[PDB]
Design a protein around this ligand. Sequence first.
Ligand code: MZ5
Lengths: 99, 99
Amino acid sequence: PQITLWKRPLVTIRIGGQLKEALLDTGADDTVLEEMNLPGKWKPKMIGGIGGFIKVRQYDQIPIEICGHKAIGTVLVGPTPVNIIGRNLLTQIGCTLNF
Amino acid sequence: PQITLWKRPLVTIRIGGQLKEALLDTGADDTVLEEMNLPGKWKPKMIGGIGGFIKVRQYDQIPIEICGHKAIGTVLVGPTPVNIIGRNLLTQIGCTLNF
Ligand SMILES: CC[C@H](C)CN(C[C@@H](O)[C@H](Cc1ccccc1)NC(=O)[C@@H](O)C(C)C)S(=O)(=O)c1ccc2ncsc2c1
């Protein structure tokens, strides 16, 4: 689809059978989701945003369906203000910026 | 133009006599620029991202040139590591997300 930007680009995602709202975020390298349980091994990581650094858990090769488009990749889980879909998964679903 | 997201969507912006690189950021409600001493009235504001909040100065009706597209609007100035072009200006230059 085409998404305009007068409102936040919030979309429904499906992960682990669960539906969540997430923000299509071209200013994020990486996808970061709010606290949740995912299976498998994770690696502790730190990431730094506009307000400082947080600790997250890195899960690799996680299937997510974003607005009906399948992705399989890395998801960071931690105290992000909002679920954000970053470029690692935006590239997978063929998302581009256009003007 | 079409901008793929294999790399950070950095473009050149112009604000007065300053040329800077900025992210076309669909995850950003507002435009946030690194520290600079713009003329005219401003108001203090707090904005939150990953890691918490920072204090910014809100300037209204500031002209900004983004890839030779004219914009004018609110710009928040503060201690960000990266210049961020938010949705308030992204819509003025006709920017959409597409997949
Ligand atoms: C809420 C979702 C999101 C976390 C908001 N942020 C935009 C997001 O694209 C920011 C943009 C950014 C990039 C580099 C350095 C700092 C910030 N990205 C990120 O926070 C993550 O990718 C970090 C790992 C950097 S932001 O913190 O930069 C931001 C940007 C604009 C804005 N306007 C009103 S509140 C507000 C917050």
